[PDB]
Amino acid sequence: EKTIRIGFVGSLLFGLLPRIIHLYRQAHPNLRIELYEMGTKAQTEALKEGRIDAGFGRLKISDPAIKRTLLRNERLMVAVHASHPLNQMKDKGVHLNDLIDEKILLYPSSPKPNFSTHVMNIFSDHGLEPTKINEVREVQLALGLVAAGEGISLVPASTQSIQLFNLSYVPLLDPDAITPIYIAVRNMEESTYIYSLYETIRQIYAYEGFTEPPNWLEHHH
Amino acid sequence: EKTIRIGFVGSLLFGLLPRIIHLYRQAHPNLRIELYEMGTKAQTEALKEGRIDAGFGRLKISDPAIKRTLLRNERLMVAVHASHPLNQMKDKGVHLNDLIDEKILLYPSSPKPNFSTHVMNIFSDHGLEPTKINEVREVQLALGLVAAGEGISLVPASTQSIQLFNLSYVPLLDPDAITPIYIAVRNMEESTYIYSLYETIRQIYAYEGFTEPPNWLE
């Protein structure tokens, strides 16, 4: 009967999204939940046209008809082969500057902007421009190729959900080597169904010891 | 300037392929190795045109121009949310038959034949036709959606490289609930570079305790 539609970006499935959806589901055994993989652009259009009710994404939205909230900044990490000299630093962590001359694997090859433009922006923003750059189709290809000895990759920290033989994840010491997670809704959105979804996020975050996201409708208050 | 070109399907990246490529690489520090993601149909055509030299995949294609060798049969597993009734039998295992009325997420949505046609073939071989079928973009979408409570999925055993909160992998009891791994080469192929690649696979299999694949050139 009652339907809630949620747009999301693929990479978030490695993060807290599934847990959040599943807990949410329990709060509303009545509710039909439709999930759609879509980019930030498609999310913006859908939200405005009423085709989704909340969008989870990694890019900022330039549209007054949409209210967007930063949930958390996810740390970036470097995926490396176990035998890479950089892995000698797994416990300590490394700096973006240490990577400029490495063969770097970007992904995905979907339309842009995407995570590959994000990574390049992170570098750019730190005054860095890697030349040994190779764009690969999807996350599992980047990781597989890294494990194969083809180079290194920058990944969100939750990518550690994937463990491959001889694949290692090195922390980045740069404060701003991050990838943001946003919720986006219709500017005038007031529904308790969305409130509940947002409260579920707050609950999970508290369990995990993350900074709690802003209070519901703080542009109102 | 010597180049070896290798075709592979993505799902093998969770298996032994990377380790193999890396080890092969060290045996030939001279060699330029190119890796290309492509399905078994594309691999078949690329081999005949000389665009790739070896192909790794999961689906057979009937072609007199290609020599295909079975390396090993991988178990299929059912991916379920930890709360799913099926997870009650995590230790025991379940049958394909227990799954027909479940909402099953197939993947990927790349050109057919792919892994989803393989999965459907496996059901078909056991006299089964599940109807609550949903084709989804990639393995990460399927597993994520499962972890979110959207249904169940069938995966190759090596896909357990992906671990998500409350995602559980259940064994299948049907002896033939498997997904094979093949190497495919040109029929007349006898290059030492491909020999070396094949022997590299043999070496890893011996380390891992897998049954050794056939002798080079039968």
From Swiss-Prot, chain B:
Write out the residues that bind benzoate 2: 16, 56, 72, 114, 205
The entry marks the following residues as binding benzoate 1, namely 11
Q: Does the keyword ATP-binding apply?
A: no
Q: Which UniProt keywords apply?
A: Activator, Aromatic hydrocarbons catabolism, DNA-binding, Transcription, Transcription regulation
State a GO cellular component annotated for this protein: protein-DNA complex
MF term (GO), any: DNA-binding transcription factor activity
Task: Name the domain of life.
Answer: Bacteria
Its GO biological process terms?
catabolic process
- Record: residues binding cis,cis-muconate: 11, 40, 115
Q: What does this protein do?
A: Positive regulator of the ben and cat genes for benzoate degradation. BenM is necessary for ben gene expression but not for expression of the cat genes, which can be regulated by CatM. Binds to the inducers cis,cis-muconate and benzoate.
Say which family it is in. Answer: Belongs to the LysR transcriptional regulatory family.
- How are the domains described in the entry? Contains a secondary binding site for benzoate in addition to a primary effector binding site that can accommodate either cis,cis-muconate or benzoate. The existence of this secondary binding site may explain the synergistic effects of cis,cis-muconate and benzoate.
**What does the annotation say about its assembly with partners?**
Homotetramer; dimer of dimers. The dimers can also associate to form linear, higher oligomers (in vitro).
The protein's name: HTH-type transcriptional regulator BenM
Specify first residue, last residue and whole-protein length for the fragment. Answer: 89 to 304 of 304
